[PDB]
Amino acid sequence: KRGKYIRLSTLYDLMTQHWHLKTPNLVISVTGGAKNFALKPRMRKIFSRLIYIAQSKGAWIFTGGTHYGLMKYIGEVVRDNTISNVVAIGIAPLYCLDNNHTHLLLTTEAKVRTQLEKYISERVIPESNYGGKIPIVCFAQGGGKETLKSINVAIKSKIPCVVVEGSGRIADVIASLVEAEGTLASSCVKESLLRFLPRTISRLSEEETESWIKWIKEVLESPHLLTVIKIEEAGDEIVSNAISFALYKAFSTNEHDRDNWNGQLKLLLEWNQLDLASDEIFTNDRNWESADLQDVMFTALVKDRPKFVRLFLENGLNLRKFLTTEVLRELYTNNFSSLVFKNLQIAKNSYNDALLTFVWKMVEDFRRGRHPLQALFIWSVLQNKKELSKVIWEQTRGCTLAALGASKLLKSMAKVKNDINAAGESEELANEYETRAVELFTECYSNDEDLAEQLLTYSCEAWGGSNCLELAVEARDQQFIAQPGVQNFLSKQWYGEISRDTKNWKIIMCLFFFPLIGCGFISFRFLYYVSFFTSPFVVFSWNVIFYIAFLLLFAYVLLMDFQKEPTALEIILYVLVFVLLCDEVRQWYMNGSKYFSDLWNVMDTLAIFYFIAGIVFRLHSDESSWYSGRVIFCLDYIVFTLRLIHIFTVSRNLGPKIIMLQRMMIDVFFFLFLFAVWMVAFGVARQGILRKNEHRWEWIFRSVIYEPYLAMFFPEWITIPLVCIYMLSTNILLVNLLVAMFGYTVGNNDQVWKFQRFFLVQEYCSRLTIPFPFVIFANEILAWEAVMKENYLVKINTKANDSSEEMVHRFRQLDAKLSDLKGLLKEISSKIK
Amino acid sequence: KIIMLQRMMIDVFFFLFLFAVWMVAFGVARQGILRKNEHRWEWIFRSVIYEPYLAMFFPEWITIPLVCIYMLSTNILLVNLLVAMFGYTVGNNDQVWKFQRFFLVQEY
Amino acid sequence: KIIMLQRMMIDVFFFLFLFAVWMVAFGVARQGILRKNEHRWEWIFRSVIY
Amino acid sequence: KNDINAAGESEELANEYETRAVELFTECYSNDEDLAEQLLTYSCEAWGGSNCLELAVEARDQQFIAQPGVQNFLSKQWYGEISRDTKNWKIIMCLFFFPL
Amino acid sequence: EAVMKENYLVKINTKANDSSEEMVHRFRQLDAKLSDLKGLLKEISSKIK
Ligand SMILES: CC(C)CCC[C@@H](C)[C@H]1CC[C@H]2[C@@H]3CC=C4C[C@@H](OC(=O)CCC(=O)O)CC[C@]4(C)[C@H]3CC[C@]12C
Ligand SMILES: Cc1cccc(COc2ccccc2C(=O)N(CCCN)Cc2cccs2)c1
Ligand SMILES: CCCCCCCCCCC
Ligand SMILES: CCCCCCCCCCC
């Protein structure tokens, strides 16, 4: 729709006050009305990165606004960036106008264009990044007389830097006449420009062709205003590597900023020029006190310059002193994206955990109003700052802990389906913090194990309120828990103070004979009995041994005993069931109404509440309910044995088979549910066909459920589709049987069961450490892993060997060596003349 | 197949052991419900083991949780059957049985 | 599991079809061996299936 | 099956147009999702008379449809105007009690 | 998506890095550099004769 045009033969105020904003940058593309322009894949990429740079910095792009070649391509990339701001101001047998430039200002036109861009270079700006002065860059890529005087009237009149590149007619000439000092090279303009564009010279006079030598040689009077985008730069970020190096040349060669090292820094920080700021600013010949490196640091954090945050820290900057109380609150509401904070609302409400509630409250108390480094780390983790958060992680104190808390915080924010691009990136970043915490902890465990396991259970000083183990189970970090350091820790927490090298049977035979513990039979690590009978392998072995002897005594009570009076056997049957209930109520904490959602732990409570009702029917003294108190004991005897069968089932397949099992358990429960649905519908069909048509009660609703199980434990033409029922009901129920068989397969497999073997054993170790009959009777290590982190960061940094075998340093280290041989060849010719 | 077999042999022996445990508990429940309440000997301890195999070779509200036993005892015993089937899979596979084929033949 | 299922559904339907073919041939063999040798109707073609 | 050399080449060229349409659409879905899903159901101005989704099911283009952009589109077409972040049980208990 | 296609064609075109690491340009860019050194060796012999 839009596009403004002004016929023209003082100007700048009629477009910054009436129309639009201010310029942090200003690019000049000069080709002129070249009706042909060979757009390669390279030149299509150079002038597409350039408009993205002008989109980022907010520049004006002055060019000739006619619909030909580059200037129609520059215009159509501008509307591509307004589809996915850029102000492409245009100034111009006959050319047609370009319908893609934002403002039009239409040979005869290249004087008002110069005297405008020479005025914007003249300005003084109180924002003052480039010493004020509004950075002007002039590109050049093609040939002709017009683009030659455009480089002239830029460089000669004022100081805008000019960038050329080696693909074109005369921009390849000046790309060849800059790697040469020949005392201005008075006729090498003729020795160039003819052998690389031979048809333009035989179209005009000699006195103007020599004027082109006068044109070119006054460009080269200042080679600090001439950057060349060379051809071998086959990579991204080479336009901004040339624009910033052109702006750094024109700024630093003002002969006024010798005391102004900071203005060179903020320029080289806005562009991502790390390898230029390291060797031209931080070289210890320049005098800085590392005290004014703080406002430059706060800009390196908010604009996401991760390589500059790392450079400021390794040149001396105490990040603990820098992160004051108000810098964190100029960072959590000023520089916090609201799309993440809106996504932080949905994660806190829909998938709520204990870590998120600390994170949601610590985001809030900074946007409403002490571990400062671990607040900057969460700030750069929530916003998916991929490489800034890797710099702050290396400065934290609890580094294995914060690598797991970040890996949990991202894994919860990637459970939100509000945007699967942000939820796909943060899941990917969480999978490389869990990997970051594996290989840091295997570095900690390759040192002494007593310190690395001191670190697993560190009290966190309220990081999230949990140690590294608790923060890894809730994140379901299967790679952190399947590592051999954590598995060795759990197998020592389960074997207890008994050594794991004694034997397996040697522990069991000490239960049946107590005086074998006091000898040198077991090789544990004065009253070793309180150490033997507190290890949860012995507590589990005694509880199963007690539970079998409880079932062999409940079998004697049921058959031989139980005449009419609850004699001395049946009273202690309450007391053994009472400690099977007293431990359940003391484990009835931490349930959340989801502990009973597994059909083997609600079965435990429903086996006692179906047994307590057997003590109710016991103490009624009538034969009509004494026998009803026996059939509810005999039915409950099978429930107590299936729990023993389930204990033997889990404790034998506690390994690689614990994933196949307990997935097949809920797959057979679904088949038995579908079989119960079919037996109900078979019961209605069998009751509706047979007799007693209308003679009914609530007899029916209690028989139809059970009549097919009593059936388990007129043929006119309907008998043939009765078989088609038994060819359909057999098919849909056998498929549910085979889905139960093979459903464990479909759906890295070592870390799946090692997480489950960890999660089940730590669930049992979180019970009481005393056996069944006796339930009624009841910053020095953070400094160590800071050493272990620096040893680890050396490992991953010197793994750049297959990138060191990429010889891009060796492809160019002999270019300096062949030019060392080149220049000595030339000067020895000058002596013998 | 010498790794699949003899791993499935000790996996079916565990299922038959758990089935024998369940048939013992089914025998106590069937003997305790039926008659001959207090008229006993060592007749009981030798019959309860065998009465369910002779069974293999008042409904007030307890009959519905009797089916929930046959929906639990079927579940925990069929899982032990399928663990016996598929337990050979979980756990370079050519050198596992070539060691066992060597170890059995050198044992003979 | 939606690929394992509905591939096993048409694989059990083929087994139940082959089982129905075998039960038909078992019905002819059991009817031809037992009595009522030549005393027949369309009683036979509706019983041998069942 | 008239010539399995020409039928082996055109199957190979079809498998790299489906791949050409996966990685173009994941580029479209790494930008805003409301425009990429505007594009899945484009009325084609009679290209073949069908959108990108209808032209991918009949081709059995399993790689175009298993990509996370198309799976996220369908899980929004199935959850409807309900957000997928509510809960699973939270939707069901509103059927039994309309004022929730 | 015409904008989204041109962003995509940039991705697959600049994936020629393992073919750029094939140094067939670098095997011949020094042949012009060694011949730059070669011809200057020959003409300096012609001056001292
Ligand atoms: C007639 C009765 C009283 C004598 C038979 C005694 C057994 C019924 C008891 C004593 C030894 C017990 C076992 C001791 C060692 C094993 C293996 C153990 O599993 C592991 O060691 C896994 C390692 C880990 O979890 O890290 C779990 C308990 C279990 C099955 C116990 C289950 C029941 C057992 C066999
Ligand atoms: C009927 C009934 C009701 C309550 C308690 C019991 C006694 O149960 C045990 C006996 C011996 C050892 C451990 C237990 C025992 O508590 N487990 C079973 C352990 C193996 N899955 C419960 C659980 C622990 C971890 C997850 S589940 C029996
Ligand atoms: C790990 C093997 C354990 C064998 C059982 C020990 C003997 C138990 C019975 C002792 C009376
Ligand atoms: C009409 C009954 C057809 C026979 C059913 C055989 C099913 C066998 C299931 C074994 C897993």
Ligand SMILES: CCCCCCCCCCC
């Ligand atoms: C209550 C009995 C339900 C039927 C049990 C079917 C089990 C089939 C096992 C075949 C491997």
Ligand SMILES: CCCCCCCCCCC
């Ligand atoms: C996804 C879990 C849904 C649970 C069922 C909700 C309750 C249904 C019964 C309400 C009377």
Ligand code: NA
């Ligand atoms: Na059936």
Ligand code: NA
């Ligand atoms: Na069946």
Ligand code: NA
């Ligand atoms: Na059974």
Ligand code: NA
């Ligand atoms: Na069974």
